[PDB]
Write a protein that binds this DNA or RNA. Structure first.
Lengths: 236, 236
DNA sequence: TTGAGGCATTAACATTTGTTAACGACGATA
DNA sequence: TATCGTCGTTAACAAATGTTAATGCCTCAA
């Protein structure tokens, strides 16, 4: 993205350097809350939370370039206790103090409205996701997450659309939907295989009937059209 | 509180007159797409969306002062097709043309930070609500929604905390959690006053065991602590 | 006074999902 | 080569939710 490149150099010019992270690494976490602003430039990560009794919840994923902030700007207090785990081999993010940011955008407005732009994407993304998950229960929640993982990591293949995401276990699909038992997602998936909406091959997933998912995730598909026109138009 | 009143007068200074609204009439709807940036100053509203087959989804509630945007600041396209229904008897809001918006923040950046932090409060709220509504299914969803309503619309009484909302009919509660039939939500509420955490009096709700809700909505409870701490202190 | 419609309550029956266990496949290690 | 642990199915049963209908309370209108 061009907007994200102008923002990159704007930080390197102000003394900010990139930090390298590897898989399984947590940029920030829910136990050591330092108010950061992370400009994930290259890589993919998952935002997660862990209840007091050990339940995992994958709130969403983040494919760079994108902006995530663990603290407010004015008050500079925590916005919540979440973990930003790296799931690709390695990722490159520009970690900056929450107070440092205030001054940078105070001089450059075009970089201000860019951060405001991504946060607007965040909002509309959560509402659309909350909409489709809350309607058709769990079966619709799986159909919804898969639709998200195909407009981002989906590549047109001979037999369907392959989700190029490493180690997408059954557990990982459950944490994203609130399901805690892998036997429940397999059952939901077995229904999508008998309906041949999805086929399972080489520990990966290939989508055949993308419209079936759209029926259970209309507001989300609508979001990819309104918020990320590029990535959306690749499969329509 | 004060951060908004300061932003109130900044609009009148630039020639933005408040437009008053009355109950049951929509500011912006899903069918007619116009991008604005509403600054609700007084009154109660709910954000809604109607599925293709008439299914309704209440996404969340809004109480002035607060900001809502039906479009993007950079691309001026709609964030999504939603409806903002006024459910209070009367509500006043400063509707602004989104094109006129970006030019109004570039002048004073202290009000840019204000509108910015409200977005951060929206993102965190969306994540927290998504977290709790997904772990414990529908029963937790109702618990979560009720907890939200107690903090925002709660006044202590000798019989419990009074949820000062008109309507809040069985059907209106299910719309927020994602339940279609009023008998399903009544079955759940039957279990809550069975366990003696709430009671139905005067077609209105008195919650008597707030902590029971905190156990099913832990993320939402801490959101109020970190985001709106004044509201949190009124019941803690 | 009667009667119509809307809401809450409960039933009952179907469907979905939570939960645990057993089975078999696949890889890794010695 | 045998053996161990991880993950995907599948079964089986319990719990929760979807769904529809009936009943009773309440207001409104004539």
């Amino acid at each position: 993205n061009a907007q994200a490149e102008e923002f990159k150099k704007y930080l390197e010019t102000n003394g900010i350097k990139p930090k390298q992270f590897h898989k399984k690494e947590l940029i920030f976490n829910q136990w050591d809350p330092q108010e950061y602003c992370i400009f994930l430039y290259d890589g993919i990560t998952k935002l997660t939370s862990i209840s007091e009794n050990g339940t995992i919840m994958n709130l969403q994923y983040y494919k760079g370039a994108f902006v995530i902030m663990s603290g407010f700007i004015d008050t500079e207090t925590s916005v919540g206790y979440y973990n930003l785990e790296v799931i690709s081999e390695q990722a490159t993010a520009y970690v900056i103090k929450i107070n440092e940011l205030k001054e940078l955008l105070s001089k450059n407005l075009t970089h201000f409205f860019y951060v405001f732009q991504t946060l607007q994407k965040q909002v509309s993304y959560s509402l659309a996701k909350f909409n489709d998950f809350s309607i058709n229960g769990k079966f619709g929640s799986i159909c919804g997450q898969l639709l998200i993982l195909t407009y981002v990591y989906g590549k047109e293949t001979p037999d369907g659309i392959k989700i190029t995401l490493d180690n997408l276990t059954m557990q990982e699909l459950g944490y994203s939907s609130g399901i805690a038992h892998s036997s429940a997602v397999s059952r939901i998936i077995s229904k999508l295989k008998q309906e041949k909406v999805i086929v399972y091959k080489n520990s990966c997933f290939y989508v055949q009937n993308l419209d079936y998912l759209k029926r259970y995730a209309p507001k989300l598909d609508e979001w990819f059209y309104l918020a990320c026109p590029a990535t959306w138009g690749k499969l329509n």
